[PDB]
Amino acid sequence: HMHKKYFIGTSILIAVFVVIFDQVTKYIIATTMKIGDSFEVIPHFLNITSHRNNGAAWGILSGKMTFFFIITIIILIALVYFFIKDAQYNLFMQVAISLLFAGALGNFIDRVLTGEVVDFIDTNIFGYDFPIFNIADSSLTIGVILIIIALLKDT
Amino acid sequence: LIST
Ligand SMILES: CCCCCCCC/C=C\CCCCCCCC(=O)OC[C@H](O)CO
Ligand SMILES: [Zn+2]
Numbered sequence: 321h322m323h324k325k326y327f328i329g330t331s332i333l334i335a336v337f338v339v340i341f342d343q344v345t346k347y348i349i350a351t352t353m354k355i356g357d358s359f360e361v362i363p364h365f366l367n368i369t370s371h372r373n374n375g376a377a378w379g380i381l382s383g384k385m386t387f388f389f390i391i392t393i394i395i396l397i398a399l400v401y402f403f404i405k406d407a408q409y410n411l412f413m414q415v416a417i418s419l420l421f422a423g424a425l426g427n428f429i430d431r432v433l434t435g436e437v438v439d440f441i442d443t444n445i446f447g448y449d450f451p452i453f454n455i456a457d458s459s460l461t462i463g464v465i466l467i468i469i470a471l472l473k474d475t
Numbered sequence: 476l477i478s479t
Contacts, residue, residue, distance in 0.1 A: 373478040373479055375479055376479075377479045378479070391476070392476060395476060423476065424476045427476065427477065427478055437478040437479075439478050451478070451479065453477070453478055454478060456478070457477050457478055460476055460477060
């Protein structure tokens with residue numbers, strides 16, 4: 321029963337726990353497997369398929385890591401500013417912003433260090449040809465679902 | 476933000 325202006329204690333350790341598990345899982349796949357290897361988790365529906373993502377879906381681009389770099393930082397700053405200005409007394413949105421912040425930072429570390437992103441989650445639950453993603457992608461998607469539910473107020 |  322705590323009603324605070326900014327739930328900084330809950331928001332940060334949510335971001336802490338997400339980044340830790342994203343970076344750890346990414347690192348476990350990098351050191352136990354080779355690119356292209358795959359082992360099953362839940363048969364016929366979830367595999368751990370080692371992949372690396374460097375934006376090759378967009379085709380030829382002069383420098384995209386720099387553009388991803390500028391994009392991620394601009395959005396990371398806006399999330400903090402969103403957190404302060406319009407997320408007051410609203411734990412639900414502050415959690416969502418944290419999920420958005422943590423999911424962006426987790427991938428941000430991958431690109432800054434290696435110039436790539438470790439992708440290992442390979443499922444057929446969302447149909448096939450759905451790309452291999454990771455925890456940082458999952459936190460972002462969940463954070464978008466929550467704000468879409470938060471955007472579905474006044475309607 | 477996302478991997479790609
Ligand atoms: C394998 C991919 C799926 C796993 C990766 C998902 C990434 C983490 C997402 C959500 C963390 C859980 C949501 C954080 C829990 C909310 C805790 C909270 O808001 O506080 C509760 C409070 O007691 C209420 O009043
Ligand atoms: Zn109360």
